């Protein structure tokens, strides 16, 4: 019987070595023959873009959605996307984490 | 019931095939010289690098039309506009300012991607868009 | 533009059936006789025929002889349902179709080809008898065509023959016109192809005259008319015999024939892609007459 | 192991570029990113028309409605032929029948007169543009998922429910297959025992169902079929006779 | 749930029973048989020889055509006579 | 509600069951025969198409029979098709 | 008076039953099926009301024309009287002429 893996969290934290890892993956996929202006390398080839994005998703846990796949045409766009962080905290947790004055109380009946 | 003798043949069905009409609008045949004697000119390939783009109709014609309301209000409508319709409006106003002596009155419908202008300037707008290559 | 709209839509709640509204300005409010503004008399005035809903018919002037009766009768629309009509086919539009490729000039051009290319709209039920080739845009028309119409003007014929081609005026009865305009519906009726009826006695002189390029005129008189038109309009008649398209230009159907390459009495299947030809002597005699 | 790469068969306009979507598989929980598919911008990236979506949804709701409500008028209510009392001298109100709407048990002045039909038809181009806009909205809001096939390892609906929960497909999922006869038996059995997971053929795709279901799932043949059907409208001629009748280049 | 099979147009020729009184006459006339043959080819089970008119119908059509359609020579002669009278 | 067979077909339906079903076929065909009577009190046009003098156009013309009432006394005599008008 | 003193029983609507789940399916049958069938052919109801719309007078005329022979005597008489009344109202009464 196949067992469903636990639901992955949507939270994302951009790694400090993100640029180096992205450059390494670009060298692996597109080849290390021409690494000049790697951030300007086009992603026109469907196979190459699929390989790069799949490797990045497997490495970092974050995958580019369909609504943003069409925007990805150069490595710089992917770098900016992975630099953009993502949070997954609930609304009540966000309100509690935000600095609340001592006279403000919030209760969550849901 | 006696019936007349009939001969079945398949060679003559080519005429029926010729008579059969099609559904897809045929592409315009290539012409050595442009514009054509009827006055039609194909869109420029590649499309011009402008913030906005104007798409040809299904008949391969400029989507500039005229409209009349109340029997006295005459308007010109540019349709199938993709991109910066505000930039298109600015360009149209700049183009039509010398002709009218004042800033033209225009409405921009961004949901439908249409530009409406007070007055009849259909031929002038068609020539302008053809020159631009849309 | 579209990309910006899609980007805005991405960061918005999912589109469902609980957040749909009509386009503003497309739904006028409905007025009902309720309230102070629209109640009481309810927009009907005071006592009278107008408020009680029983007022004279349209055109009644209150007893005075009406304007639509006091004018003497004259013959304007008398016999309108029996007047034959012809849709105009301008040379500008014909050149437009040829340039766009909707009507190829390398084959004979007639009502079937025009309808297939959506150049004309023929309504046999509205007393239409075909297309008249008007002379609009004759100066700029430059196309070698073999055009078949029902009426043709002298200027249009001159333009066609100057550019090089054959223009012929043919007649169709209403039934033949319907069949030639929409052959596909006819072949689904399971009926043999009928014969093209002769023109009426009032139209025989038009189609038996060489000056009108009639399809029942003497072939030997065509060159005289063509040369006369060329002399009148100041162009040289081009000898089409030396042209490679001579057979296509001279391809003319029989006056008793509806479709090119098809004879009356044949039945098309359009399912087995086969044509059945009768061999009975009486049927052959009737159809070849 | 090889990626599933899908390209657009129909000619994309020169001034636009095809959009891109992931191609996943239903054979495993983590079998995402099996390939990449290119989608025609005029179908999956057209302008968002919420007004057109509303028009198409209202048309679907109202065009096949038949209202059977009916009431009896004073001419149909039983009795009431005679005058209840003389016109003058009684000292009471003057009446002509006992089945008048003013009377208890009488007729209805302006009641429903069913059966009533609310039939009307939007233009074919508008009805196709509604589907185009719905697909584009789903793609833009990331409610659309493309699959190589709908085959499941088992017919247990709980597996599909757990897979949807794992992949965050929301409460309602609408699976679309190319043909009804060739639907996999595993997915058929999985969907037959579920309520919020509905399997329909490509012919049955509609704006109402797409809006009702939070997530839409399409196959590659379904995407090709939809692209062809929706882009045929943008280039078809005006009809001379119904398209069910033979044409030179139709169907296909 | 799974949707019901899509509604498909009824395949094959239809031959309503002539014995039933509720069967419409246009579904029993020979024109119906001709239309079915034209639409469905030879699978309709209709003899193609019946499409062409019977000898009686042919004679009736010939008589009507002779009565209400003058020949070209007759029309030309009548036109000539009328022109001579007017002149 | 509605009937399945229309009212005018009820007599034909009754002629298909019961005692009427067992009647000989030739008599049933004779009853079903509805040949138009020879015109007596009206003059038929004699032609299917006629030219209308008002517009000079060919029009289809029909010969509508004149209703004829046959008194019961006529059933014991030979009136040759004549009857009260 | 005239208003209930107790709350009515709660009303539960099964938003995901078969009918509501499959509502609207096959609406684009002609568009997505080579126009073999028209969407109006899926409408079920009275024979005289199938892909047709009109006012009350037109509906009555259509019903009398199509199923008038099959109607009951009283129903047919009421339909005839209704048609007469509607004719008089729509051709002899009103505000706009
Ligand atoms: K008032
Ligand atoms: K007032
Ligand atoms: K009125
Ligand atoms: Mg307008
Ligand atoms: Mg009051
Ligand atoms: Mg007064
Ligand atoms: Mg008053
Ligand atoms: Mg009464
Ligand atoms: Mg009385
Ligand atoms: Mg009264
Ligand atoms: Mg009551």
Query: Which residues are registered as beta bridge partners of F57?
Result: F52
Query: Which residues are registered as beta bridge partners of D219?
Result: D147
Q: What is the 3-state secondary structure (H, E, C) of chain B?
A: CCCCCEEEECCCHHHHHHHCCCCECCCCCCCCCCCCCCCCCCCCCCCCCCCEEECCCCCCCCCEEEEEECCCEEEEEECCEEECHHHHHHHHHHHHHHHHCCCCCEEEECCCCEEEEECCCHHHHHHHHHHHCC
- Residue pair B114/B78 in contact (Cβ under 8 Å)? The answer is yes
Please report, for residues E22, F19, F23, F44, the alpha-carbon distance to residue F15 in angstroms, rounded to integers and kept in the order given: 16, 8, 9, 34
- Residue pair D207/D130 in contact (Cβ under 8 Å)? The answer is yes
B/e letters for A37-58, b = 16+ CB within 10 Å, e = fewer, are ebeebebeebebbbbbbbbbee
Task: Tell me A61's DSSP state.
Answer: S
How many angstroms separate the CA of residue F55 from the nearest CA in chain C?
Answer: 7
**Token pair belonging to D114:** 């069913």
Task: Tell me C72's DSSP state.
Answer: P
Give the ligand whose atoms come closest to the C-alpha of residue B77.
Answer: 4
Handedness of CA D30, D31, D32, D33 (dihedral sign): positive
The set of residues, in sequence order, having a beta carbon less than 8 Å from that of A91 and lying 6+ positions away, is none
Rounded CA-CA distance B56/B129 in Å is 11
CA atoms within 13 A on the CB side of F52: 8
Three-state DSSP state, C55: coil
Rounded CA-CA distance C200/E74 in Å is 11
Q: H or E stretch including C24?
A: none
Question: Could you tell me the CATH number of the domain that includes residue E21?
Answer: 6.10.280.120
Rounded CA-CA distance B71/B75 in Å is 11
Place of tokens 């014969």: C195
Handedness of CA C172, C178, C179, C181 (dihedral sign): positive
> Into how many domains does chain E fold?
1
- Residue pair D83/D95 in contact (Cβ under 8 Å)? The answer is yes
**Token pair belonging to D152:** 């499941």
Domain of D235, in residue numbers: 2-251
E interface mutation test: which of D179, D181, D187, D201 has the most E CBs within 10 A?
D201
Q: H or E stretch including C268?
A: strand C267-268
Q: What is the 3-state secondary structure (H, E, C) of D92-149?
A: CCCCCCCCCCCCCCCCCCCCCECCEECCCCCCHHHHHHHHHHHHHHHHHCCCEEEECC
> Into how many domains does chain D fold?
1
Which residue in chain B is spatially nearest to D51 when comparing CA positions?
A: B111
E interface mutation test: which of C190, C196, C203, C281 has the most E CBs within 10 A?
C190
Task: Tell me C151's DSSP state.
Answer: E
Q: Which residues in chain G (11-30) have CB-CB distances under 8 A to chain E?
A: 18, 21-22, 25-26, 29
**Token pair belonging to E20:** 């039933």
- Residue pair C264/B14 in contact (Cβ under 8 Å)? The answer is no
Place of tokens 């719905």: D134
The set of residues, in sequence order, having a beta carbon less than 8 Å from that of A84 and lying 6+ positions away, is A14
**Token pair belonging to C15:** 């589109």
Q: H or E stretch including E66?
A: helix E55-68
Quote the ligand 11 centre to D107 CA distance (angstroms).
5
Place of tokens 């009533």: D116
Rounded CA-CA distance C41/C50 in Å is 12
Cβ contact, residue pair E1, G21, below 8 Å? yes
Candidate from F5, F13, F49 with C-beta closest to E68:
F49
- Residue pair G55/D252 in contact (Cβ under 8 Å)? The answer is no
- Residue pair C92/C134 in contact (Cβ under 8 Å)? The answer is no
Whole-angstrom Cα Rg for chain B = 23
Task: Tell me F51's DSSP state.
Answer: E
Q: In terms of C-beta distances under 8 Å and separation of at least 24 residues, what long-range contacts does G73-76 make, across chains too?
A: none
Candidate from A2, A5, A46 with C-beta closest to D159:
A2
Rounded CA-CA distance C269/C282 in Å is 23
A interface mutation test: which of D5, D8, D20, D158 has the most A CBs within 10 A?
D20
Q: Is C6 on the interface with D (CB under 8 A)?
A: yes
Rounded CA-CA distance D196/G16 in Å is 6
- Residue pair B68/B60 in contact (Cβ under 8 Å)? The answer is no
Please report, for residues A59, A93, C180, the alpha-carbon distance to residue A87 in angstroms, rounded to integers and kept in the order given: 18, 12, 70
| F49-52/F57-60 β-pairing | antiparallel
Rounded CA-CA distance C122/C116 in Å is 12
Helix axes C2-10, D124-140, angle to 10 degrees: 60
Cβ neighbours of G67 in F, within 8 Å: 2
Rounded CA-CA distance C257/C140 in Å is 34
Cβ neighbours of E5 in D, within 8 Å: 180
CA angle B134, C2, C6 (to 5 degrees): 165
Rounded CA-CA distance C125/C127 in Å is 6
Rounded CA-CA distance C236/C222 in Å is 15
Bond into C72 cis (ω within 30): no
**Token pair belonging to E36:** 């079915």
Give the ligand whose atoms come closest to the C-alpha of residue C33.
Answer: 1
The set of residues, in sequence order, having a beta carbon less than 8 Å from that of C287 and lying 6+ positions away, is C192, C195, C263, C264, C265, C278
Q: Which of C214, C244, C211, C241 is nearest to C228 (CA)?
A: C211
Rounded CA-CA distance A88/A82 in Å is 16
The counts of H helices and E strands in chain F are 3, 2
| D116-117/D173-177 β-pairing | unpaired
Across the D/E interface, how many CB contacts are shorter than 8 Å? 23
CA atoms within 13 A on the CB side of C162: 20
Q: Which of D27, D24, D5 is nearest to D145 (CA)?
A: D24
Cβ contact, residue pair F12, E22, below 8 Å? no
Place of tokens 């007393």: C127
How many angstroms separate the CA of residue E82 from the nearest CA in chain C?
Answer: 11
Q: Which of C266, C273, C278 is nearest to B6 (CA)?
A: C278
| B52-54/B81-83 β-pairing | antiparallel
Domain limits of chain C? 82-289
CA atoms within 13 A on the CB side of G46: 23
- DSSP-assigned letters across all residues of chain D: ---EEE---SPPPTT---EEEEEE-SSSTT----EEEEE-HHHHSS---HHHHHHHHHHHHHTT-EE--B---TTTSS---S-SS-SSSSSS---S-TTSTTSTT---SS--B-SEE------HHHHHHHHHHHHHHHHHTT-EEEES----SS--HHHHHHHHHHHT--S-EEEEES-STT--HHHHHHHHT-SSEEEEEGGG--HHHHHHSSEEEEEHHHHHHHHHHHHHHTTBPPPSS-TTS--SS---
**CA end-to-end distance (rounded Å), chain C:** 67
Rounded CA-CA distance C222/C218 in Å is 7
Helix axes B122-132, B85-100, angle to 10 degrees: 120
Rounded CA-CA distance G24/G40 in Å is 13
Bond into B35 cis (ω within 30): yes
Q: Which of B71, B81, B78 is nearest to B121 (CA)?
A: B78
The set of residues, in sequence order, having a beta carbon less than 8 Å from that of A8 and lying 6+ positions away, is A61
Which phi and psi (to 5°) does residue C55 adopt? -125, 160
| B64-69/D197-201 β-pairing | unpaired
Q: How many CB atoms lie within 10 A of CB B2?
A: 6
Q: How many CB atoms lie within 10 A of CB A20?
A: 10
Q: In what order do the strands lie in the sheet with C267-268?
A: B6-9, C275-278, C267-268
> Into how many domains does chain G fold?
1
Rounded CA-CA distance D67/G53 in Å is 12
Cβ contact, residue pair F6, G69, below 8 Å? yes
How many angstroms separate the CA of residue G86 from the nearest CA in chain C?
Answer: 14
Quote the ligand 3 centre to G95 CA distance (angstroms).
7
B/e letters for D44-71, b = 16+ CB within 10 Å, e = fewer, are bbbbbbbbbbbbbbebbeebbebeeeee
- Residue pair D52/D173 in contact (Cβ under 8 Å)? The answer is no
Candidate from E34, E61, E79 with C-beta closest to C201:
E79
- Residue pair C190/E34 in contact (Cβ under 8 Å)? The answer is yes
- Residue pair G60/G82 in contact (Cβ under 8 Å)? The answer is yes
Across the D/G interface, how many CB contacts are shorter than 8 Å? 100
**Token pair belonging to D120:** 């009307």
Residue positions counted in chain G: 97
Rounded CA-CA distance D56/D53 in Å is 5
Q: H or E stretch including C169?
A: strand C166-169
Bond into C48 cis (ω within 30): no
- DSSP-assigned letters across all residues of C80-146: GGGS-EEEEE-HHHHHHHHHHTSS-TTS-B-HHHHHHTTS----GGGTEEEEEE--TT-TT-----E
F interface mutation test: which of G66, G69, G73, G78 has the most F CBs within 10 A?
G69
Q: Which chains touch F (3 or more CB pairs under 8 A)?
A: C, E, G
**Token pair belonging to B97:** 């300012």
Q: Which residues in chain D (216-245) have CB-CB distances under 8 A to chain B?
A: 232, 234-237, 240, 243
**Token pair belonging to C266:** 């044949």
Q: Which residues surround ligand 8, an ion (CB under 5 A)?
A: D 81
The set of residues, in sequence order, having a beta carbon less than 8 Å from that of B6 and lying 6+ positions away, is C267, C276, C277, C278, C279, E48, E49, E52
- Domains of chain B, earliest start first: 6-134 (3.30.780.10)
The set of residues, in sequence order, having a beta carbon less than 8 Å from that of G58 and lying 6+ positions away, is none
Rounded CA-CA distance B84/B76 in Å is 19
Chain breaks in chain E (C to N over 2.5 A) after: none
How many angstroms separate the CA of residue B100 from the nearest CA in chain C?
Answer: 29
Domain of G78, in residue numbers: 1-96
Q: Which of C208, C213, C254, C255 is nearest to E76 (CA)?
A: C208
Rounded CA-CA distance E86/B133 in Å is 65
Q: Which of D152, D133, D112, D145 is nearest to D57 (CA)?
A: D133
Q: Which of A4, A84, A44, C10 is nearest to D144 (CA)?
A: C10
The set of residues, in sequence order, having a beta carbon less than 8 Å from that of C107 and lying 6+ positions away, is C113, C146, C248
């Amino acid at each position: 019987i196949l067992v469903c893996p636990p639901l992955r969290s949507r939270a994302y934290t951009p790694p400090e070595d993100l640029q180096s890892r992205l450059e390494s993956y670009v060298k692996e996929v597109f080849g290390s023959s021409l690494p000049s202006n790697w951030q300007d390398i086009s992603l026109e080839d469907s196979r190459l873009k699929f390989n790069l994005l799949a490797h990045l998703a497997d490495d970092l846990g974050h995958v580019v959605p369909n609504s943003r796949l069409h925007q990805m045409c150069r490595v710089r766009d992917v770098l900016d996307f992975y630099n953009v962080p993502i949070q997954d905290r609930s609304k009540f947790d966000e309100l509690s984490a935000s600095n609340l004055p001592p006279n403000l109380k919030i209760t969550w009946s849901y | 019931p006696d019936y007349p003798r009939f001969v079945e043949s398949v060679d003559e069905y080519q005429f029926v095939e010729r008579l059969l009409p099609a559904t897809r609008i045929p592409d315009p045949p290539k012409h050595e010289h442009y514009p054509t004697p009827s006055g039609w000119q194909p869109p420029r390939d590649p499309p011009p690098n402008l913030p906005y783009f104007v798409r040809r109709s299904r008949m391969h014609n400029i989507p500039v039309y005229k409209d009349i309301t109340h029997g006295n209000r005459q308007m010109t409508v540019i349709r199938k506009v993709e991109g910066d319709i505000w930039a298109l409006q600015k360009d149209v106003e700049d183009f039509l300012s010398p002709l009218l002596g004042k800033t033209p009155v225009t409405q921009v419908n961004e949901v439908t991607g249409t530009l409406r202008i007070k007055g009849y300037f259909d031929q002038e707008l068609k020539a302008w868009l053809l020159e631009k290559g849309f | 533009g579209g990309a910006r709209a899609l980007d805005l839509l991405r960061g918005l709640p999912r589109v469902s059936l609980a957040n749909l509204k009509p386009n503003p300005g497309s739904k006028k409010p409905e007025r009902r006789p309720r309230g102070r503004r629209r109640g009481r008399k309810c927009g009907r005035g005071h006592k009278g025929e107008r408020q009680r809903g029983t007022r004279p018919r349209l055109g009644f002037e209150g007893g005075q002889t009406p304007f639509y009766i006091r004018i003497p009768k004259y013959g304007f629309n008398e016999g309108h349902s029996f007047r034959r009509q012809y849709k105009p086919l301008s040379l500008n539009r014909l050149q437009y179709l040829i340039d766009l490729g909707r009507v190829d000039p390398s084959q004979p051009i007639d009502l079937t080809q025009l309808v297939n290319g959506r150049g004309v709209t023929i309504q046999p039920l509205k007393r239409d008898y075909g297309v008249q080739l008007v002379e609009e845009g004759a100066d700029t028309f430059t196309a070698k065509v073999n055009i078949e119409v029902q009426l043709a003007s002298e200027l249009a014929i001159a333009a066609i023959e100057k550019n090089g081609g054959v223009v012929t005026t043919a007649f169709y009865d209403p039934r033949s016109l319907d069949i030639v305009c929409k052959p596909v519906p006819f072949f689904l009726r399971g009926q043999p192809i009928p014969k093209r009826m002769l023109p009426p006695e009032e139209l025989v002189p038009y189609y038996t005259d060489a000056k009108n390029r009639g399809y029942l005129a003497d072939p030997a008189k065509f060159p005289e008319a063509r040369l006369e038109l060329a002399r009148k309009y100041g162009y040289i008649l081009p000898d089409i015999t030396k042209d490679e398209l001579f057979k296509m230009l001279c391809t003319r159907k029989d006056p008793r024939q509806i479709f090119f390459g098809l004879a009356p009495g044949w039945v098309v299947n359009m399912a087995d892609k086969k044509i059945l030809k009768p061999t009975d002597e009486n049927l052959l005699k009737y159809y070849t007459s | 192991p090889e990626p599933v790469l899908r390209k657009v068969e129909l000619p994309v306009p020169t001034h636009r570029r095809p959009v891109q979507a992931w191609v996943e598989s239903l054979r495993g929980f983590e079998q995402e990113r099996v390939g990449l598919a290119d989608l025609h911008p005029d179908v999956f990236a057209t302008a968002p028309r919420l007004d057109i979506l509303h028009q198409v949804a209202m048309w679907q709701k109202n065009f096949k409605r038949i209202s059977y409500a009916k009431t009896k008028t004073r001419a149909e209510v039983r009795g009431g032929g005679r005058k209840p009392w003389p016109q003058k001298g009684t000292g009471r109100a003057r009446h002509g029948s006992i089945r008048s709407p003013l009377w208890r048990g009488g007729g209805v002045a302006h009641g429903p007169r069913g059966p009533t039909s609310y039939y009307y038809m939007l233009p074919m181009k508008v009805r196709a543009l509604g589907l185009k806009v719905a697909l584009t909205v789903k793609l833009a809001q990331d409610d659309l998922h493309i699959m190589d096939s709908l085959e499941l390892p088992t017919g247990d609906p709980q597996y599909l429910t757990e897979l949807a929960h794992y992949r965050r497909w929301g409460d309602s999922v609408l699976l679309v297959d190319l043909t009804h006869e060739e639907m996999p038996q595993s997915i058929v059995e999985a969907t037959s025992r579920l309520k919020t997971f509905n399997l329909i053929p490509a012919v049955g795709l509609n704006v109402h169902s797409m809006l009702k279901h939070q997530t839409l799932v399409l196959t590659l043949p379904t995407v090709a079929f939809l692209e062809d059907k929706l882009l045929w409208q943008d280039s078809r001629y005006r009809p001379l006779y119904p398209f069910s009748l033979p044409y030179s280049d139709f169907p296909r | 749930y799974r949707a019901r099979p899509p509604p498909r147009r009824r395949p094959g020729p239809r031959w309503p029973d002539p014995e039933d009184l509720l069967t419409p006459r246009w579904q029993l006339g020979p024109r119906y048989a001709a239309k079915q043959f034209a639409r469905y080819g030879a699978a309709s089970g209709v003899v193609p020889g019946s499409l062409w008119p019977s000898p009686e119908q042919l004679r009736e059509l010939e008589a009507e055509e002779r009565e209400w359609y003058p020949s070209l020579a007759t029309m030309q002669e009548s036109l000539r006579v009328k022109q001579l009278a007017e002149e | 509600p509605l009937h399945k067979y229309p009212v005018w077909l009820w007599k034909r339906l009754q002629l298909r069951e019961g005692i009427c079903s067992r009647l000989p076929g030739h008599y049933l065909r004779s009853l079903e025969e509805e040949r138009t009577p020879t015109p007596v009190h009206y003059r038929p046009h004699g032609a299917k198409f006629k030219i209308n003098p008002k517009n000079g156009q060919r029009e289809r013309v029909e010969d509508v029979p004149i209703p004829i009432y046959f008194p019961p006394e006529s059933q014991r005599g030979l009136w040759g098709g004549e009857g009260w008008i | 008076i005239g208003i209930r003193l107790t709350l009515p029983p709660p009303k539960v609507v099964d938003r995901w039953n078969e009918k509501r789940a499959m509502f609207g399916v096959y609406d684009n049958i002609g568009i997505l099926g080579n126009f073999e069938k028209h969407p109006k052919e899926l409408i079920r109801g009275p024979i005289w009301l199938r892909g047709w719309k009109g006012n009350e007078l037109q509906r009555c005329i259509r019903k009398r024309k199509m199923v008038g022979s099959r109607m009951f005597a009283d129903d047919l008489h009421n339909l005839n009287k209704r048609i007469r009344y509607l004719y008089k109202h729509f051709n002899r009464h009103g505000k706009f002429r």
